[PDB]
Amino acid sequence: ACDYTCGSNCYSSSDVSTAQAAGYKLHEDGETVGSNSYPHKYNNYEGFDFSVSSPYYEWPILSSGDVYSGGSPGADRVVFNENNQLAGVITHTGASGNNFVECT
Numbered sequence: 001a002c003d004y005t006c007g008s009n010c011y012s013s014s015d016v017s018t019a020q021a022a023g024y025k026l027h028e029d030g031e032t033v034g035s036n037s038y039p040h041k042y043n044n045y046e047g048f049d050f051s052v053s054s055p056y057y058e059w060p061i062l063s064s065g066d067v068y069s070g071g072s073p074g075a076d077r078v079v080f081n082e083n084n085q086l087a088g089v090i091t092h093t094g095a096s097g098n099n100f101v102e103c104t
């Protein structure tokens with residue numbers, strides 16, 4: 001079973017932790033990867049009711065199992081905060097335009 005289901009993509013908790021660790025490391029060092037500069041601030045315009053405090057940062061999680069290193073980020077993201085606490089896993093899949101919906 002999937003711990004997180006983003007459209008057709010299936011992720012386990014270990015998939016999420018691995019992605020999160022990479023994005024947080026880059027955040028701590030003040031560095032970014034990709035043309036869209038990840039990780040970067042996630043404003044939560046959608047208004048998700050996260051259990052942890054802001055600010056939030058988004059980082060791509062890939063269905064390939066690889067850690068993001070540039071190029072197309074796909075539709076899925078892991079959102080973490082300043083304390084490296086997982087806020088949630090979100091996706092563009094099943095959402096209008098560039099909006100997000102939570103992965104179930």
Ligand SMILES: Nc1nc2c(ncn2[C@@H]2O[C@H](CO)[C@@H](OP(=O)(O)O)[C@H]2O)c(=O)[nH]1
Pocket residue numbers: 036037040041042043044045046058098099100
């Ligand atoms: N939909 C949405 N996009 C956000 C939010 N905060 C920041 N963004 C950025 O706006 C764009 C929406 O897809 C993305 O930028 P990017 O294209 O540079 O990756 C995304 O990172 C937010 O709360 N909601």
Ligand SMILES: [Ca+2]
Pocket residue numbers: 010011012015065
């Ligand atoms: Ca996996």
